[PDB]
Design an enzyme around this catalytic site. Sequence first.
Site, PDB file in Angstrom:
ATOM      1  N   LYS A 136     -12.415 -10.437 -37.770  1.00  0.00           N
ATOM      2  CA  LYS A 136     -11.441 -10.917 -38.874  1.00  0.00           C
ATOM      3  C   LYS A 136     -10.437  -9.722 -39.266  1.00  0.00           C
ATOM      4  CE  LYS A 136     -10.615 -13.777 -42.823  1.00  0.00           C
ATOM      5  NZ  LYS A 136     -10.853 -14.597 -43.667  1.00  0.00           N
ATOM      6  N   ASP A 159     -17.629 -18.059 -54.736  1.00  0.00           N
ATOM      7  CA  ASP A 159     -16.833 -18.638 -53.826  1.00  0.00           C
ATOM      8  C   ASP A 159     -17.654 -19.391 -52.736  1.00  0.00           C
ATOM      9  OD1 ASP A 159     -14.290 -19.280 -52.653  1.00  0.00           O
ATOM     10  OD2 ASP A 159     -14.277 -17.471 -51.227  1.00  0.00           O
ATOM     11  N   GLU A 176     -16.016 -24.341 -45.906  1.00  0.00           N
ATOM     12  CA  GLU A 176     -15.521 -23.375 -44.905  1.00  0.00           C
ATOM     13  C   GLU A 176     -16.098 -21.956 -44.741  1.00  0.00           C
ATOM     14  OE1 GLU A 176     -14.179 -25.410 -47.546  1.00  0.00           O
ATOM     15  OE2 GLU A 176     -11.958 -24.684 -47.659  1.00  0.00           O
ATOM     16  N   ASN A 177     -16.727 -21.436 -45.820  1.00  0.00           N
ATOM     17  CA  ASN A 177     -17.318 -20.345 -46.032  1.00  0.00           C
ATOM     18  C   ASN A 177     -18.881 -20.345 -45.704  1.00  0.00           C
ATOM     19  OD1 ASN A 177     -14.953 -19.284 -46.611  1.00  0.00           O
ATOM     20  ND2 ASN A 177     -15.611 -19.076 -48.790  1.00  0.00           N
ATOM     21  N   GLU A 183     -21.093 -10.711 -37.920  1.00  0.00           N
ATOM     22  CA  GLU A 183     -21.906 -11.283 -36.933  1.00  0.00           C
ATOM     23  C   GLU A 183     -20.962 -12.775 -36.800  1.00  0.00           C
ATOM     24  OE1 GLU A 183     -25.325 -12.526 -39.396  1.00  0.00           O
ATOM     25  OE2 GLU A 183     -26.053 -14.026 -37.823  1.00  0.00           O
TER      26      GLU A 183
HETATM   27  O1  LIG Z   1     -11.608 -13.017 -45.980  1.00  0.00           O
HETATM   28  C1  LIG Z   1     -12.700 -12.386 -46.355  1.00  0.00           C
HETATM   29  N1  LIG Z   1     -12.536 -11.700 -47.691  1.00  0.00           N
HETATM   30  C2  LIG Z   1     -11.448 -11.127 -47.981  1.00  0.00           C
HETATM   31  C3  LIG Z   1     -10.306 -11.656 -47.605  1.00  0.00           C
HETATM   32  C4  LIG Z   1      -9.133 -11.572 -48.168  1.00  0.00           C
HETATM   33  C5  LIG Z   1      -9.009 -10.590 -49.386  1.00  0.00           C
HETATM   34  C6  LIG Z   1     -10.222 -10.103 -49.779  1.00  0.00           C
HETATM   35  C7  LIG Z   1     -11.581 -10.360 -48.856  1.00  0.00           C
HETATM   36  N2  LIG Z   1     -14.144 -12.595 -46.185  1.00  0.00           N
HETATM   37  C8  LIG Z   1     -14.430 -13.499 -45.122  1.00  0.00           C
HETATM   38  C9  LIG Z   1     -14.132 -14.940 -44.985  1.00  0.00           C
HETATM   39  C10 LIG Z   1     -14.475 -15.660 -43.932  1.00  0.00           C
HETATM   40  C11 LIG Z   1     -15.379 -15.177 -43.259  1.00  0.00           C
HETATM   41  C12 LIG Z   1     -16.026 -16.203 -41.955  1.00  0.00           C
HETATM   42  C13 LIG Z   1     -14.951 -15.905 -40.789  1.00  0.00           C
HETATM   43  N3  LIG Z   1     -15.264 -16.915 -39.586  1.00  0.00           N
HETATM   44  C14 LIG Z   1     -16.375 -16.642 -38.897  1.00  0.00           C
HETATM   45  N4  LIG Z   1     -17.011 -15.697 -38.955  1.00  0.00           N
HETATM   46  C15 LIG Z   1     -17.939 -15.251 -38.219  1.00  0.00           C
HETATM   47  N5  LIG Z   1     -18.268 -16.058 -37.247  1.00  0.00           N
HETATM   48  C16 LIG Z   1     -17.742 -17.355 -36.814  1.00  0.00           C
HETATM   49  O2  LIG Z   1     -17.798 -18.129 -35.744  1.00  0.00           O
HETATM   50  C17 LIG Z   1     -16.790 -19.193 -36.323  1.00  0.00           C
HETATM   51  C18 LIG Z   1     -16.848 -20.347 -35.382  1.00  0.00           C
HETATM   52  C19 LIG Z   1     -18.005 -20.222 -34.327  1.00  0.00           C
HETATM   53  C20 LIG Z   1     -17.840 -21.349 -33.266  1.00  0.00           C
HETATM   54  C21 LIG Z   1     -16.726 -22.477 -33.519  1.00  0.00           C
HETATM   55  O3  LIG Z   1     -16.835 -23.401 -32.707  1.00  0.00           O
HETATM   56  C22 LIG Z   1     -17.811 -23.434 -31.817  1.00  0.00           C
HETATM   57  C23 LIG Z   1     -17.916 -24.783 -30.960  1.00  0.00           C
HETATM   58  N6  LIG Z   1     -17.857 -25.691 -31.828  1.00  0.00           N
HETATM   59  C24 LIG Z   1     -19.072 -26.004 -32.804  1.00  0.00           C
HETATM   60  C25 LIG Z   1     -18.946 -27.107 -33.792  1.00  0.00           C
HETATM   61  C26 LIG Z   1     -18.692 -28.462 -32.937  1.00  0.00           C
HETATM   62  O4  LIG Z   1     -18.139 -29.300 -33.989  1.00  0.00           O
HETATM   63  C27 LIG Z   1     -17.529 -28.348 -32.052  1.00  0.00           C
HETATM   64  C28 LIG Z   1     -17.814 -27.076 -31.191  1.00  0.00           C
HETATM   65  C29 LIG Z   1     -15.884 -22.440 -34.574  1.00  0.00           C
HETATM   66  C30 LIG Z   1     -15.996 -21.224 -35.464  1.00  0.00           C
HETATM   67  C31 LIG Z   1     -16.165 -18.909 -37.155  1.00  0.00           C
HETATM   68  C32 LIG Z   1     -16.484 -17.723 -37.860  1.00  0.00           C
HETATM   69  C33 LIG Z   1     -15.913 -13.879 -43.153  1.00  0.00           C
HETATM   70  C34 LIG Z   1     -15.366 -12.954 -44.166  1.00  0.00           C
END
Ligand SMILES: O=C(Nc1ccccc1)Nc1ccc(CCNc2ncnc3oc(-c4ccc(OCCN5CCC(O)CC5)cc4)cc23)cc1
Length: 255
Positions: A37, A131, A135-136, A86
């Site tokens: 990310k 939170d 989405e998360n 992860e």
């Molecule tokens: O932003 C954060 N903190 C923060 C931000 C700003 C300021 C302060 C803190 N934290 C944060 C926020 C969100 C996340 C999650 C990020 N997204 C992901 N992370 C880890 N692994 C992941 O895998 C995916 C993902 C994996 C597979 C995928 O599709 C696979 C195939 N698809 C599967 C579904 C089907 O319907 C269609 C076919 C789609 C997405 C997303 C993802 C992690 C950390």
Amino acid sequence: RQWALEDFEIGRPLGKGKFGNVYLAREKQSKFILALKVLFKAQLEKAGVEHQLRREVEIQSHLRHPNILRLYGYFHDATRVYLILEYAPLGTVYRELQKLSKFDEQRTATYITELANALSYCHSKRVIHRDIKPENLLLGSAGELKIADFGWSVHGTLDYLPPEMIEGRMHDEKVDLWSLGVLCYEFLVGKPPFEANTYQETYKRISRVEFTFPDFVTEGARDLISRLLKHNPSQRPMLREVLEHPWITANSSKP
Ligand SMILES: O=C(Nc1ccccc1)Nc1ccc(CCNc2ncnc3oc(-c4ccc(OCCN5CCC(O)CC5)cc4)cc23)cc1
């Protein structure tokens, strides 16, 4: 382990965030597949949230649980901060809601159990999420649910926020129980219960806890959801009572 961007092969975009993009990636030395990310310093700084991310990384690295997404590490360069996450190969629960529209009671109860186990462990290590939203919520290779994003943990749409957070009050760990209730409804119905077309109306409805059920939501589910969406935090049940709810035990496939 003083990581640099040049240690990874970057693959396809997994998602677009407010503050940054998530990419699939592979570490060159080991071929370890992970998610990367990428957040922008200029944008976090200007929004005053860079600290929050120092906190997330600090907090999420004391957490180890099968229903919480791991943060392996972090680095940064002139202008960007990178979180090494992860990889969750089955994607977000959000996308799953799109594809399926709504979930049956068995998927829903199973997901709430996973959430409730995850949150119980967090509460035990003195951590509140603040939170929870689809989405998360990520899905591991066996379809196990994984809580992501500890950017807002302590100790935009309003849809998943409790009254005490929108009404500008002290909050505690009961925040997370309200969140369970919003998700349990959204899973069964396919939209969160306070959804509206304006911020102003959604606020109103969260504040009043004004929502109704579609005829197909069963009585057990209505009972659980109603206990979780109480305006007063102290009237919400403990996580241990959610796990003991007869609707949860009747329908969940996990313990
Ligand atoms: O932003 C954060 N903190 C923060 C931000 C700003 C300021 C302060 C803190 N934290 C944060 C926020 C969100 C996340 C999650 C990020 N997204 C992901 N992370 C880890 N692994 C992941 O895998 C995916 C993902 C994996 C597979 C995928 O599709 C696979 C195939 N698809 C599967 C579904 C089907 O319907 C269609 C076919 C789609 C997405 C997303 C993802 C992690 C950390």
